[PDB]
Amino acid sequence: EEDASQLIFPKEFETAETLLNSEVHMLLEHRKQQNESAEDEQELSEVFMKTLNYTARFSRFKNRETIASVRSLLLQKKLHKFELACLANLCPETAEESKALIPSLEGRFEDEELQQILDDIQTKRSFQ
Amino acid sequence: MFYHISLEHEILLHPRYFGPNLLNTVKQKLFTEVEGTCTGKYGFVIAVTTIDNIGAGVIQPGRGFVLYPVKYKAIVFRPFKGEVVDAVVTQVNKVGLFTEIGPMSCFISRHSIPSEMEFDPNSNPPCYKTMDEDIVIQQDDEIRLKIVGTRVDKNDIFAIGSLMDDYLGLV
Amino acid sequence: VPAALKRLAKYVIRGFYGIEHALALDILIRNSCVKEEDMLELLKFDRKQLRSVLNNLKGDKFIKCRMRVETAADGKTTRHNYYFINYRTLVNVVKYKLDHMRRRIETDERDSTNRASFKCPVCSSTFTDLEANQLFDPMTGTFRCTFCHTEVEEDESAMPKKDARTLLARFNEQIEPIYALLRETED
Numbered sequence: 408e409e410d411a412s413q414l415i416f417p418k419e420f421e422t423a424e425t426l427l428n429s430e431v432h433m434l435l436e437h438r439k440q441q442n443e444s445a446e447d448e449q450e451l452s453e454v455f456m457k458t459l460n461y462t463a464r465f466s467r468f469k470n471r472e473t474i475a476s477v478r479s480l481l482l483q484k485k486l487h488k489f490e491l492a493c494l495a496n497l498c499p500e501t502a503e504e505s506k507a508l509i510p511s512l513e514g515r516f517e518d519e520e521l522q523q524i525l526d527d528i529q530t531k532r533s534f535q
Numbered sequence: 536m537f538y539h540i541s542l543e544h545e546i547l548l549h550p551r552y553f554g555p556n557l558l559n560t561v562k563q564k565l566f567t568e569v570e571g572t573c574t575g576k577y578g579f580v581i582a583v584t585t586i587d588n589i590g591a592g593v594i595q596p597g598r599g600f601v602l603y604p605v606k607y608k609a610i611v612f613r614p615f616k617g618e619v620v621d622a623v624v625t626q627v628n629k630v631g632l633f634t635e636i637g638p639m640s641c642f643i644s645r646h647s648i649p650s651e652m653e654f655d656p657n658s659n660p661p662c663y664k665t666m667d668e669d670i671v672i673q674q675d676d677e678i679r680l681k682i683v684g685t686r687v688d689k690n691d692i693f694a695i696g697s698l699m700d701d702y703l704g705l706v
Numbered sequence: 707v708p709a710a711l712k713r714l715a716k717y718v719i720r721g722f723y724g725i726e727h728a729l730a731l732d733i734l735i736r737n738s739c740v741k742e743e744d745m746l747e748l749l750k751f752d753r754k755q756l757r758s759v760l761n762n763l764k765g766d767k768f769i770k771c772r773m774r775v776e777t778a779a780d781g782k783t784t785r786h787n788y789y790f791i792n793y794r795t796l797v798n799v800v801k802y803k804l805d806h807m808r809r810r811i812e813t814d815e816r817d818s819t820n821r822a823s824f825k826c827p828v829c830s831s832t833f834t835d836l837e838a839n840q841l842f843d844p845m846t847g848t849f850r851c852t853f854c855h856t857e858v859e860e861d862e863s864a865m866p867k868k869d870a871r872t873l874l875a876r877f878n879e880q881i882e883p884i885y886a887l888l889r890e891t892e893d
């Protein structure tokens with residue numbers, strides 16, 4: 408009934424906002440910071456550690472300002488909220504690669520313009 | 536896919552917890568119950584980002600408990616059929632490959648694995664390698680798999696990873 | 707009554723019905739309409755036996771019946787059942803009975819993919835491939851049955867799959883004469 412490729416989601420997943428792994432890491436880090444405070448409180452569950460490592464491993468942006476800048480530029484482009492997370496998560500190097508992964512992305516914009524959008528993410532991306 | 540959504544949960548607070556710090560206990564009790572539990576509709580729940588509001592505590596007639604409906608914002612991850620998500624291989628076996636994606640764990644059957652891949656029992660660390668060794672998949676590697684289907688049982692969800700589709704596997 | 711219609715009806719009755727059905731059809735071919743009572747004497751069949759065949763023929767609408775009521779010479783009421791062949795309605799039923807098999811053949815192609823291969827020998831219950839991983843016990847490292855705690859095999863389900871494939875080619879060959887006749891009866 409629900410397919411990511413077909414952009415079909417249930418009524419619950421309609422107004423939901425998608426957060427990038429780097430954005431997710433910041434929120435989880437804030438939880439960790441609060442965890443240290445208020446000693447003797449409940450210790451965070453092991454599931455929290457698993458996700459925190461996962462988001463940190465795939466974190467494409469280590470700077471808070473860059474994450475905001477990427478989101479601001481993406482907001483100008485008329486892109487679906489779910490597709491924005493995939494675009495900023497997978498970070499395809501080529502326009503053709505992005506189109507193949509997401510069949511629904513075909514026809515949204517011009518191929519030449521699609522490649523430029525991906526290239527911009529690379530410039531903001533920090534290589535270590 | 537990671538989603539930040541608002542969830543409805545009900546807390547039954549024992550009368551012993553009444554008095555000062557009642558709402559603190561309700562908030563604290565919310566984290567313990569929600570965290571570490573998964574449901575098919577929303578999948579695994581990582582943590583509660585914040586609590587939107589605590590509803591009026593309706594006393595249960597006879598029971599003595601007070602039912603507190605809580606609107607809390609939490610981030611959850613749910614496997615979507617026909618979707619490609621990065622995965623980390625935990626264990627390698629001839630029968631199939633086990634991979635963990637955050638709290639969710641995915642199992643890859645031998646049939647779904649590409650034909651050219653063959654189990655490497657001789658090597659001390661079990662792994663899948665080709666004849667030409669162009670691509671090698673072993674434990675603790677980042678690979679891409681397609682979620683063929685989603686199954687939920689006993690508050691646990693584990694999907695099937697298939698590497699038949701192109702642009703999959705170790706990159 | 708074009709000769710093509712007569713031959714088409716004969717070819718189908720002798721292929722999927724008993725000799726009883728075919729014999730009654732010949733009477734309706736020689737004469738456009740024949741009384742039910744008259745047909746009974748010629749065939750010498752039992753009263754119930756003839757009705758059962760006629761009901762089956764009427765069930766498939768290969769022939770239609772009309773009731774004529776008249777006063778006999780002795781004054782008693784007479785209710786004669788007159789049977790006749792409706793080619794226009796008959797051809798549709800033949801097409802309906804043929805397309806369903808063709809669509810059933812198409813369905814057989816999809817059934818082969820969803821067949822359940824895993825099965826427990828103890829409880830003799832077959833489980834789908836997707837359901838197989840549900841019962842997978844990590845401690846054992848192999849498929850198992852929760853009810854029986856016994857190993858689950860999949861080799862027994864491979865043999866019957868190939869049998870259905872052979873029927874596809876044969877069905878299309880034996881049915882060509884019927885299809886050819888249908889094309890000749892479109893006018």
Ligand SMILES: [Zn+2]
Nearest residue numbers: 826829851854
């Ligand atoms: Zn059994």
